[PDB]
Homo-oligomer: A and B are copies of this chain.
Amino acid sequence: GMKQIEDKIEEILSKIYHIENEIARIKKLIGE
């Protein structure tokens, strides 16, 4: 496929990991 498609997938995976880190910080503060 497109190199642009693969580039977008890279950005998406980075965004998701950043979101999962944010959710981990929230669950740690509130307990779950």
A contact residues vs B (CB 8 Å cutoff): 1-2, 5-6, 8-9, 12-13, 15-16, 19-20, 22-23, 25-27, 29-32
7 other A-B residue contacts (CB within 8 Å) besides A25-B32, A26-B26: A1-B2, A1-B5, A19-B23, A22-B23, A23-B23, A26-B27, A30-B30
The one of B1, B8, B30 that contacts A26, using a Cβ cutoff of 8 Å: B30
Q: Smallest Cβ distance from A24 to chain B, in angstroms? A: 9
A5 to B2, CA, bound (A): 10
Please give the count of copies of this chain that the complex contains.
Answer: 3
Q: Which residue of B lies closest to A3 (CB)?
A: B1
Asked whether B6 lies within 8 Å of A12 as measured between CB atoms, the reply is: no
